[PDB]
């Protein structure tokens with residue numbers, strides 16, 4: 001394919017002629033994104049240029065992790081790859097990676113909604129999340145900026161968009177043994193924000209965050225306190241449930257019920273994505289024959305400590321072996 005090279009905000013962009021009208025959209029810690037017109041399909045696409053993929057072992061592993069993940073994601077409510085490319089002709093000159101996906105045009109942060117909107121948006125997050133969780137993946141950072149949305153309200157989960165507010169309390173306590181329901185806590189927070197037009201737990205730090213959570217959900221019972229190893233955490237928690245019905249007064253009572261089953265302190269007793277999809281609140285959208293699960297996903301590389309050249313070679317193999325969707 002014939003590549004062409006141009007400069008957008010001091011960043012060099014070298015892409016196939018397939019992609020036209022490159023327009024800068026923004027950036028993150030892990031790269032920069034342009035909007036572009038895909039002449040092959042006539043659709044608009046988001047192109048992400050990874051910034052310095054192989055600067056370090058951690059960058060190299062992060063690059064591999066992203067490419068491997070997005071190659072696996074094949075679902076309507078989850079970001080996947082239309083294309084992956086590098087201007088490098090060989091492994092020896094391999095130093096850039098570009099990822100291409102279908103463009104939605106907005107995130108959930110740039111969007112007080114009606115109840116039907118909330119039903120549809122949250123249903124799509126949970127449908128996508130069921131698929132993600134079925135591959136034994138935990139997102140760990142669900143928040144509005146990691147949810148890409150259409151102008152007809154279709155939603156896809158992103159891995160990194162353009163945080164503590166939506167984090168499960170056990171992550172704040174640094175438990176390290178997280179259940180997948182950490183993502184369901186995050187969904188609970190987002191859902192509440194959409195309904196009420198305001199952040200549920202706008203903590204100023206990780207400590208204030210727990211205070212705000214405790215004010216709504218109540219102090220943990222005896223059964224939860226005995227699971228907390230940290231003497232400091234236990235001393236802070238004990239040195240301090242609101243009627244959800246009233247906190248979310250005016251909302252759909254089925255929306256309030258679901259929210260009570262998501263924002264549960266005990267991660268064991270939180271509703272799963274698959275369980276939440278069958279809640280009466282989503283009766284208009286729930287179709288158990290169209291809520292698919294994922295092919296098992298090999299994350300065994302995550303426990304490996306490899307050199308940059310090894311990560312880099314493995315990333316290159318995954319670029320060359322990429323087969324686009326139909």
Ligand SMILES: O=c1ncn2nc(Sc3ccc(F)cc3F)ccc2c1-c1c(Cl)cccc1Cl
Pocket residue numbers: 025033034035046047048070079080081082099100101102103104105106107145147148149158160161162
């Ligand atoms: O609509 C989008 N669709 C996809 N992405 N992807 C990314 S990152 C990315 C990931 C995988 C790709 F193949 C390519 C990538 F760029 C970032 C934003 C984005 C948007 C978007 C836009 Cl264009 C504007 C405002 C807010 C958002 Cl969430």
Ligand SMILES: CCCCCCCCO[C@@H]1O[C@H](CO)[C@@H](O)[C@H](O)[C@H]1O
Pocket residue numbers: 169170175177178179210211213214220224227237265266267268
């Ligand atoms: C400040 C509010 C108190 C937070 C209590 C969080 C309880 C989280 O729940 C706990 O999650 C752990 C990690 O997945 C599991 O090991 C436990 O079984 C579970 O009870």
